Each structure stands twice: as structure tokens, then as C-alpha cells.
Amino acid sequence: KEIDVSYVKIEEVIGAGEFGEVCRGRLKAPGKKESCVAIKTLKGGYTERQRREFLSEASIMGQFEHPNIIRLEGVVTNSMPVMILTEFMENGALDSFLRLNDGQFTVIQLVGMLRGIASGMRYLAEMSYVHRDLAARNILVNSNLVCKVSDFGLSRFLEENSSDGGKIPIRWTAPEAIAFRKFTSASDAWSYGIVMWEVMSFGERPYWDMSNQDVINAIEQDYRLPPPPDCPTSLHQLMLDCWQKDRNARPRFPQVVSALDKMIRNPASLKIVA
Numbered sequence: 001k002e003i004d005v006s007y008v009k010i011e012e013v014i015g016a017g018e019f020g021e022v023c024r025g026r027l028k029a030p031g032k033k034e035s036c037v038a039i040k041t042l043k044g045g046y047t048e049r050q051r052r053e054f055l056s057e058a059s060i061m062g063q064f065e066h067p068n069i070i071r072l073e074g075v076v077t078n079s080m081p082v083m084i085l086t087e088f089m090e091n092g093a094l095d096s097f098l099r100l101n102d103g104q105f106t107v108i109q110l111v112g113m114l115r116g117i118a119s120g121m122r123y124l125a126e127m128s129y130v131h132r133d134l135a136a137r138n139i140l141v142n143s144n145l146v147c148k149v150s151d152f153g154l155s156r157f158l159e160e161n162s163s164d165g166g167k168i169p170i171r172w173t174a175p176e177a178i179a180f181r182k183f184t185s186a187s188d189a190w191s192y193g194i195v196m197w198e199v200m201s202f203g204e205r206p207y208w209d210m211s212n213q214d215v216i217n218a219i220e221q222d223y224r225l226p227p228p229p230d231c232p233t234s235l236h237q238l239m240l241d242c243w244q245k246d247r248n249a250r251p252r253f254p255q256v257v258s259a260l261d262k263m264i265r266n267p268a269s270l271k272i273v274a
């Protein structure tokens, strides 16, 4: 949806993206109430290929409609700067939000966040969309702590193209996807297990200071991240299930959501910790 630039007011720069600023603003279109939006801008100096890559995120987001997937409002392409407008997520990225609030949300709250992410992923997998960069930094959080998946793009990773979309995010990536570049919803399930660990650790870095090659070798040699402090064993076991070497043995997203719903209904089960 092309948005008339007169309908947009930019209020404040709140972040930096790959191609430009991220801003908070207001969108007011005839016949509709004013709403808060996030705005990504692309200013001058870009190639047309870069413009297409920037806008491809809008095209992809616009294919989706789900309460746990970032909603596209529209784009501005007939003037400069070029913009993508979405719903505004007041609390920003989950990893940083959790680090700010370390130890300050309950296990049930954390499970609800994880449930929202899992529902978003359930939807994407149903749509045959493989995310490929599922990480807490790509989850956005609103004022009511609802978590939504962000970061959409279909460009191959650098390792998939010419000998001579960025690099594969090794710490989040399933071993077969690193080895063979076969990205599937089952490799996203591996990534989702890593997100679980990030959330239950209030935004710690997966594998601490281990090098990328150290991580690859460790996983091949059966190492898996340990339960975060105070993490319910049932949640850690779901992580381990997501991290099965055999992709076909990992839970699919409907099963992940089911498991989390059961936990929420049976909160006593979350009391067992190592």
C-alpha cells in the first residue's frame, strides 16, 4: 500500500537499521483513526538493487497477517526518503528488553512470550516461509509484552552465492543448515530452541565467548547449551528437543505451541528446576 507522505509524521529516531534510520511516528489516513507506527527510512546514495532489497521486506511482510507477526501499514516509494511503515512495538527488541529487565519477569510471563513467538513461527511454517534468522534480536515486544516476529527477506546468505542477505548466523543455525545450506522450518525449530535459551537467560549471548567454529565443532561433538539459571527443566527439555541433530525428530511448531500451552495451564510443572 502506497502511503501519501502527508499522512506520516516522524516523531523521533529510535534505532538504526541496515540501510538507514528507524523512527517512531504517526500515520493518519482519511477515514481512519491516527495510529503509532515504526518507520524505516532509506535516504540517498543507495543503488537500485539496494532499494529493491530494502523494499523486499515490505513485500514479504505484506504477505502475512497474524497477531505475532509484525504488521505492515505501507510504504512510501514516490518520494524521498523511501519508507516502510509498520505497527509500533514500544519495547523494541526482546534480547535488549530482557537484559534491561533481568530477573524482573516471572517464568509464566517468559513462557507467554515464548508462546507468542512460537505461534508466529507456526503461522510462518504453515505459509511455507522459512525465516532463517530466528533470534531474540529479531523479536519485537509491545506495551502488553506481546512478542512478534520480525526481519523478513529472501536473499540467500553470502555463503550461498558466488564464490567471489549477510552471513549465516552461526550460533542460531541448525547444523545441517550450516553444513549444507538446507534451510527448512525444522532448522527454524533449532533456532527457536536458541531463542528459548535467550529468553530464559534474560538475553545472554548463546555460547558466550565461543568462536563460530568452536560452536560448530561443539554441536557436532554433542554439546548443547545448559539450562539457564532458574530455568524449569521442562523448558530446557523442549530446547533439547529443538536441538536434535536429526531434523525430523525436532518438534514442529504446532507441537511447540501445544507444549507451551500445557505448561501455562499446568504451572506447577514449571517448579522443577536443576
Ligand SMILES: NC(=O)c1cccc(Nc2nccc(Nc3c(Cl)ccc4c3OCO4)n2)c1
Binding pocket: 014, 015, 016, 022, 038, 039, 040, 057, 070, 084, 085, 086, 087, 088, 089, 090, 091, 092, 093, 140, 150, 151
Ligand atoms: N532498536 C530499534 O530499532 C527499536 C527500538 C525501540 C522500539 C522499536 N520498535 C519497532 N517497532 C516496530 C518495528 C520496528 N522495526 C522495524 C523492523 Cl524490525 C522491520 C521493518 C520495519 C521496522 O520499522 C518499520 O519497518 N521497531 C525498535
Ligand SMILES: [Mg+2]
Binding pocket: 131, 132, 133, 151, 152, 153
Ligand atoms: Mg532474515
Ligand SMILES: [Mg+2]
Binding pocket: 133, 151
Ligand atoms: Mg537478518
Ligand SMILES: [Mg+2]
Binding pocket: 102, 201, 202, 229
Ligand atoms: Mg542472568
